[PDB]
Amino acid sequence: QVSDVGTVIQVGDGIARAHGLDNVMSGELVEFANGVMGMALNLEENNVGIVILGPYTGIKEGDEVRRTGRIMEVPVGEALIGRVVNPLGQPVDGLGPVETTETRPIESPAPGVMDRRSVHEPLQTGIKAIDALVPIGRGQRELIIGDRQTGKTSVAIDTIINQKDQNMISIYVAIGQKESTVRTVVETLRKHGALDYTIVVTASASQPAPLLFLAPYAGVAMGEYFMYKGKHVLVVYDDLSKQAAAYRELSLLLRRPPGREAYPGDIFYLHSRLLERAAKLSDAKGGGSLTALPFVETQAGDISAYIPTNVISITDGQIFLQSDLFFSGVRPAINAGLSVSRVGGAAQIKAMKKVAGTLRLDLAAYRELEAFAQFGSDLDKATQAKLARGARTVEVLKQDLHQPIPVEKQVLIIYALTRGFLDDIPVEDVRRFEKEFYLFLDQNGQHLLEHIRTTKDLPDDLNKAIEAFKKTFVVSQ
Amino acid sequence: SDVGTVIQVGDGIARAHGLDNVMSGELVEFANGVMGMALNLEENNVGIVILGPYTGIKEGDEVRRTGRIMEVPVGEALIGRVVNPLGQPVDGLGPVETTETRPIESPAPGVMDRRSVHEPLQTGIKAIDALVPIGRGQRELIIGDRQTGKTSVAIDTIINQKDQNMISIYVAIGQKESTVRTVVETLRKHGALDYTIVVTASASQPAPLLFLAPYAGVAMGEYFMYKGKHVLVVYDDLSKQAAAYRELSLLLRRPPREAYPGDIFYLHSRLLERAAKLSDAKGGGSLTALPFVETQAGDISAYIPTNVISITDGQIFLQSDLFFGVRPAINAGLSVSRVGGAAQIKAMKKVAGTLRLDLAAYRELEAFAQFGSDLDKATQAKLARGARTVEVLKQDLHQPIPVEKQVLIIYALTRGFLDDIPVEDVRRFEKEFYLFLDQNGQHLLEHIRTTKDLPNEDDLNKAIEAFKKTFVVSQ
Amino acid sequence: TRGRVIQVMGPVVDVKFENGHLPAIYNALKIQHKARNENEVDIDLTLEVALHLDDTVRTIAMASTDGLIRGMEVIDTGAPISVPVGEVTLGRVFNVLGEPIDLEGDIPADARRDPIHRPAPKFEELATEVEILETGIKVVDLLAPYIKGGKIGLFGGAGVGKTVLIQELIHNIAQEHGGISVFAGVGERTREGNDLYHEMKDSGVISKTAMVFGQMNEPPGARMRVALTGLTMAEYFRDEQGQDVLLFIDNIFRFTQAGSEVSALLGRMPSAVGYQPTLATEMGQLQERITSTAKGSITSIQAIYVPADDYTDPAPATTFSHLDATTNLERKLAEMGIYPAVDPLASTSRALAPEIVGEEHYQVARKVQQTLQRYKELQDIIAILGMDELSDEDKLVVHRARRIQFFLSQNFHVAEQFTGQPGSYVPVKETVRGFKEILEGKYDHLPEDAFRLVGRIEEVVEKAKAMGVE
Amino acid sequence: GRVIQVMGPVVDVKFNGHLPIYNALKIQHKARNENEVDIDLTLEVALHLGDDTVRTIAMASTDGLIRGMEVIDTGAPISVPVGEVTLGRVFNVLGEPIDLEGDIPADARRDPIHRPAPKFEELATEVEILETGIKVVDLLAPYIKGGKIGLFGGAGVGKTVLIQELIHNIAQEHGGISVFAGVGERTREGNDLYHEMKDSGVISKTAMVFGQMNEPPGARMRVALTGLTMAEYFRDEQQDVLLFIDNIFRFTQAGSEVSALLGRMPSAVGYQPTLATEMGQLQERITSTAKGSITSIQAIYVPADDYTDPAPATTFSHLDATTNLERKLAEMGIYPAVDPLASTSRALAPEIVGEEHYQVARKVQQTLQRYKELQDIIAILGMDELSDEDKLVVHRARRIQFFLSQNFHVAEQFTGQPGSYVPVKETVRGFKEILEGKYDHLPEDAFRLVGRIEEVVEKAKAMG
Amino acid sequence: LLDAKASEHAARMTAMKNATDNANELIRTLTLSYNRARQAAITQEITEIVAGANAL
C-alpha cells in the first residue's frame, strides 16, 4: 500500500517520473490522481519513468500516482466489430460504449514454431496486380512500402472492402494518420459495408506518442481473439514508420541511450515481436489466421532508410509502390519489379497459379525493355512483340478504385491477354474491354466462372479458349 | 550581490560564483582589468565570456559588475578608422573621439517601421546591377569558395559609393590582419575611407570577439540609419563568426547539428534582420548588408550556407568553376535577388529585363548548340546575342562603371546594335562606344542620370545614336 | 501565486514557486519589473511554462531575456497565452502575445481572448464527406482543387505574384463564401511582411483579414507560438460563427525549426538531424487543429521552404504528411504573361479524383494536363525543326495547348488597381465547361491573345469579336 | 604542486594561492626505492579547474608518475634559448640542445614560446614576388617575399620533396636567416636534412628545431611555437627570415589528441572546439613587420585527401600563396603534382606580375579547365565525337599539363635525372609558345619532366 | 555505299557499346565512392547524435 503508489517528480512532454510505486511491474498501467492513465517503462532505483497516455498538462508535481497491478491490457470481443476506438479501446465514434465481456493483454507471445501451419489458404485482395504477382495468404505478412500519396491506404481499404464474401474479420489500425482522413476512410467503409466485419483502432497525429506506440499492439490484441478461435483476421497497420517514430520520441524522453538515426536499440525488437504475432495456427489449434499488412511511408523512396529496411527484412516480402507511376495515372502504383511475395504461390489458387506464371514474364521483360521507345523510332526485332502484350498487361493490371475484382472473373482476364485473346485489341480499348468482358461473363459465362469457383482450377482451358472469342467477336472497337 | 569570484578559467571562457545581480548579457569586469560578458545565468555560477586575453586571469579573481549592457562607440569620428569590435582604434591614428554610445544587441525595425526598398545600391559591377540588382536596405548574401572574388566584389562596391551617399562599414571576422590591411590600404588609394569604417577581429583574436564583431558593426551603422542617412555593412565571412560562436558555445558546454548550437540560426537571423528600409515616417533611413559565407567544395547544401540563405533576400554565388571564362565569377544560374527590379531605376528596368531572357535561353539552349546549323533554325539566332551578352556581362577588376553609360551597353546588345559585331569583339566595343559617348553625343549620357528613368532619348535618338558609334567603329 | 527566477539560459528561464502553487504547463507567466536603480533595466516579459523540473518550472521566453536578474519574481496569469478573437481582430495586426503592433489603438479589457493551446476536434466532430472549396481561380479549381478544411502547399516565393494569389484568395473566399482569413508570418523576413501589409491595405482585403507577425528577428518562443496565435483567431469564426475561414501560414518551417532550437535548451535528446524528438507530435497538435467540424471549417495555405531543395529533411517530410494538395508557382509562366503563375503540371491535388469531383471535372482536368505535356516535350523539337513538321497533329496540340495554358490566366480582383479590368470569379462548373470545349477544339479559330487573361469561356468570345471575328 | 591525477599526456597537479596559465611545471623526483623510476618532466599549465587545481599538458612520456608527487612551478611559460647562439644547433620542444654539442649559456636570452600576435600597426602590406625556379608555382601560383606559403598535400604526394627543392632553390641563395622546424614530421628527414646542411654549407645560418612522430601530443603542440619564437628573434631583435615549418598539420593534429582529455566538447569530426582560434594565435605571429620580414613555407598534410577537413581547410585563410597537391596528378606522373586550377597566389595581379605574365597565366589555366570539362566525354565516348577545335585544346592542354612537370634536384638519386631551375622569364615564354602553337607537332612525352622549353625540343629529337 | 553504310551502322552499333560498357564502369567507380560517402555520412550523423547526448 505505502509502496504501491508514488508521487510525481517531473512532468513534461508526455512523460512523468514518479516516486514510490516500489511494486509497479515494468509495463504496468499507472493512474494519475487526475484520472489520466499512463505506463511504467523505466523502473530505476530512485524513480520510475512513466509515459502519460493522454493530456499531460493536467499533471503537476506532487500529484499522486497509484498503481493498477495490470499489464496494459485491452478490451476484446464480438462487440467491437463495427466500432471506432482508440488504442485503449475507448470508443471515439460517438455511438455508446463498447459492451464486451472478455479482455486480452496487449503484450502477448506469438504462436510457437510448432503451433503454426505453412500458409496455403489465400487472401483475395481483389487487386489484379497484387493477388496475381504479389500474392498474400492468410497468416502471412505483406509489407506495403511506399512514398506518401502513393495509394498505400487505398489498397488496404479496397482490400478490406473485398472481405465481405470471404470469411475475414478486418482490423484497420491507424497510426499517426490524420484523424481527418481516418474518419473519411472509416466512412467510405461505412458505405461499402465494411463495418460489419471491420474494427478500427485510431491514434491520430494530434494524440500523444505513447498512444501511437500502443495502437499497433492494441490492434493485434483484438485480432488475436478471433485467431485463437479459428476465425480469420486481417490487420492493416497503417504506417509503422510513424508508430516506430512515436516510440523514438517517447524513448528519447525517458533519456534512453539513442541509437543509429536516434532510434532506441530495441527499435528492431519493437516491430519484430509485433509482426510475428500474425500467423497461421496449426490444425492442432483450430487452424486460425491473422494476416498483417504493415505500411512503411518512404521519403524519396529511399528503401535504404533504417526503419523501412528493418521491416522489409521482417515481413514475408513487400509491395513497393512507385511514386511516379501514381502520377502518370497508373492505379495501383505497384512496382512489379521490386514487389515480391515470398510465401507466394501457395497462396494463389490453381486457376491463378497457371495464368499467373507467365504474367511475371511478359511484365518482366517489358520492365527491362520499355526504357526504349523514343529511340525505338526504328522499332526493331520481335522485341516489339514482347512490348506488344506487355504494354497491354499493364492496362489489365490497372484497376479502378473502390472496385474490387473476384478471382473467378479475374483469372479470365489475366487469361485473355496472356493467351493473345486480348492482343488483337489496342491498348486504347484494353481497359474498357475487360469491363464488359466481365458482364459478358456475368450473363453468358456465369456457368464458366463457376467451375473456377468450386474447383479453384482450370484443367476450362478448352472451353474458355473458344468461349473467350464469343466476346471479342461481339465487342465494339 | 555585485561582486564575483572566478571558479574556472580557460579558453577565453570562465565560470564564477557570486554576481547575484547580473543581467543576462551584462558586461562585467575582471580583476586584471579585462572585460567579459555573462551569457549563462546558472543557479550556482555564471558563464562569462572573456572579452580579451585570458592569461592575466586566475581562479578566485574578482569579477566586478558594471550594470551596463554591452555597447560600443558610434559617431562621425569613426569614418576611415580601423577599430576593433569594442571601438578601440587599431589603425594608430589616435583615439576615436565619440560622444554617443550604442548598445550591441538592439531591436530591429518593426513590421510597421519599414518601407519597400525602392532605392538601388549601385554596385558598379554590370553583371550584378543588371542581373541581380541590389536595393538600399537589402540583404544580398555573396557566398562562394575560398578566393572566388568575394572580398574584391564588396570592395569595388564600396569604392563605387563616392557619388552616392553611403557610409560603408567593412568588418573582417576571422580574416587575416595583414590582409585586412591591404584591403583598408587599397581603400585609401581610391579614397573610400572618406565614408567607410572598419571592424577587424583578426583570426588571432578570441572567438567571442569575432562573434561580437558583426553586431558591433551594425550598431555603428544603425546610427546614421535611424538618423536618415544610408549605410552599407559588409559582413565579411559570417562563416568564421559561426565557427567562432560554436567554440564559444562548446566551451560553455552548451548542448550541441554539426556541433553548431541549436540557436546557431538565430545568431545570424537577429543580425541581418537589423538591416532594412525605415518608413518615411522615420526619415527614410537604410542599412544594406553584404554578408559572406566560405563554402567547402562549393557545397551550398552545407549547414551554415542554407541558414544564411534562408535569411538574406537573394544571394550572389561565386563559382571559381569559372574565373579559371566569365570573370567576376558570378553564377548567373543560382544567383538571385528577391527585391530585385524594384531596385533598378527605370533606365535599368526596361533594358535589364530582357537581359534575363537572352541569358536564360543561352543557359538553356546550350544542351542544343552542337547541332549548330545542321538544322536548328531560329534558335542559333537567339543564340547569337546570347553568346554576345555574356561578353557584356564581363567586367574587369577594379573598374566600376556608372549607371548612365552602363544601361547604354546593356541596351545596344539587347536591341541588335551589338550583333553586326562578332562575339569576340564586344569587350572592345564597351571601351569604345563609351568613350565616344563621353564625347560623341553626351546628351543621353546623363539624362539617364537626371530623370534616372525612361527613354534616355525618346527611342529614335538612342536607337540612331547607337547607329552613330557602330557605324564609326573598327574591325 | 508568485515565484522567482532561478536560471536564465538564453531564451529559457527557470522560475521557482516555493510551494503548492506551480503554474500548470502551458500557462503564461508575466514578469513586470521596474528598474530599482541605475544598474538595472525595465522588464516587461511574458513566459510560457514548459516543464516542472523541486517546485521548479522552466519556461520559454516569447521575447528577449536580456536584463533578467536571478530572483525577480514571476507572476502566474493562471492561464496560457490568450489572444483576442472576433471582429475585433479583423484588419488588426498583433504579435505572438496577441498584442496589437499597429497604430490603430489597443484591445479593450472587455474582449474575449481565448488560449493558444487547445486539442483538435473529437473524432465525432469532423466532416464526414470530403467537400471541395471553390476558389473561383481557374488554375486551381481545375488542376489542383483545394479541399475545404485541408492544408495546401505553396512553393516558390520570388517575384511570382505569390502575394496576389494569397491576397486574391482572401478576396474570393470572403466574397463568395463569406469568411475571414488570418495571415500568420512565422519567423520569415520582416521586409516581406511590412510590404504585404501595405499591399493588403491597398487591395482593401485587409478589411477581411487579421494578421500576426512572429518574424525572423524574434526569439525561439515567439516563432514557435505565432502559428498558434493566428490559429486561435481563425478557429473563432468557425466554431462560433460557422464560417469557412482561411488560415495562411507563411513559412510553417520556422515553426518546427525554432522548435529544435529550444529543445536543446530544454534538454531534450537530439533526434534525426538535430531536430527535436518531439517534432512529429508538435506539428500534429498544430495541424490537426485545422479541419472542418460539424459547424464551420478552416483551410490553410502554408508556404514551405525545404532545407536546400531537399525533400527528405525531417521538417518538410513531417509537414507533407499533413498536406492535401500542392500549389506550385513557377517563375516561368509569369514571364510568358500567364497569371496566375501556377505550374499546371506540378500543382497536384488529392481531391482531383472522380470520386471527389466526378468524371467531367477529372476527365477534363487530367486531359488538360496531358495535352500540356505534349506541348512541353515538343518544345525541344520546335527549336530544332521550326514549326514545319510535327506529324501535323503535334500542331493541333500546340494550338490547343497554348489556348489552354493561356486560358489558365485570369482577371484578378486584386489586379483592378493597376489594370482596371474588374476581375472574375469563374466557378469550377464554368471552368470545366470552358476547357471542355477548348479541348473539343471549338475555339481553334480565335487568336491566342483572346483566352489570355479572361473569365468564363464567354469572356473569350467578347475578347474575340473585339479582335474582329464573326 | 602535488600531482593527484594522471591522464595520459594530461596531468592534474593540485596546488592555497599558489595557482601558477601557460606556465611550465617541472616534476623533479628521484627514485626513493626500486618500485619507482626517475622522472624529469615539464608540464604546461592549461586551465584552472578550480578548487586550487590545474590541468597540465606534459612534454614527454608521463609513465612512472604517481599520485601525491611534487610539482615545481618555474613561474614562467616554456622559455627557450634565443640569440645568435641558436645558429647551427638543434633544440627540443623546450629549447634543449639535442645535437650532442654542448649546452646553452646561462646568460643566453630565453624567450617564452607564447607571445601575442603583432598589432595592426606592426604587420606589413608591401608586395614583392619571389622566384622559386618552379614552372608551375612561378606561373600559376607565385610566392611572395615575407608572405605565407602553404603546401597542401595528402600522404606520399611530394610535400617533403617540394620543401627540399624550395630550401635548395631558395634558402641556399637568399642571404637570409633560416629557421627550419620540423613539426610532427619524419625522424629520418631530420637526419637526412641535418647532415645535408653540413654538405651544402649553411649549417651556420639555419636554426634546427625538432619534434617528430615518436613524441607525445603535448610536444608537437608547442614545437611550432618554439621554432616560431626563434625566427621572431631575428625579426624583432635585429633581418628577413625564412621560416620552414614542416607539416603545421601535426600541430592541430596533436591538438585533438589533447582536446579530448582536457574535457572539451568535441567539434566537427571530433576536433577541438578551439581548432580555429588555436591556429589564429599561431599564424599571424608568423608574419613580417616594419621591423623584420618573415617568408614562411609550411607543409600542410591533407588527412584522407580531404581538403574539407577542419585542419587544412581552416589553414587556407592563413596564406598569401598556396600550392595544393593532388594524388591524381601524382599517379599521372606529373610532379610536382600541383593542381594548376587550385593553387593560387595574391600575386597573380597585372598590378603585381605584369600583364604578359598574367594573361599567359590565365590562358594556361583557361585551356586546362576547358580540358577538364571535356574529360567526362572522353571517358565515355573517347575523342571521336569532339570537334576539330576541342581536340586541339585536348593536345595543348595535355602537353601544357605535362610541361608543368619539373625535374627537382632532390629527386635525382632515385630517377637518375639531374635537375633544373627554370627562370621565370623562361617559364612565361615556354608556355607562350605552347599556347601559341609552335610546338603542336611535338609528341606529349617529349614535354614530360623537363626544364626550359628548349629542352623539350632536345628531348624531342631524341625520341625520333 | 551499301558496304559503307553497313559499316556505319556497325561502327555506330559498336561505338554505342563501348560507351554503354564504359558508362557502366563509371557506375562501379561511383557505386564505390557512393558507398564510401554513404558510410562516412551515416557514421558522422550518429557520432553527432550521441556526442550531443553525452553533452546533456
Ligand SMILES: Nc1ncnc2c1ncn2[C@@H]1O[C@H](COP(=O)(O)OP(=O)(O)O)[C@@H](O)[C@H]1O
Ligand atoms: N619531383 C619528383 N620527381 C620524381 N619523383 C617524385 C617527385 N616528387 C615525389 N616523387 C616520388 O613520390 C614519393 C613521395 O615523396 P614525398 O615527397 O615523401 O611525399 P610526402 O612528403 O608528401 O609524403 C617519393 O617516393 C618519390 O619517389
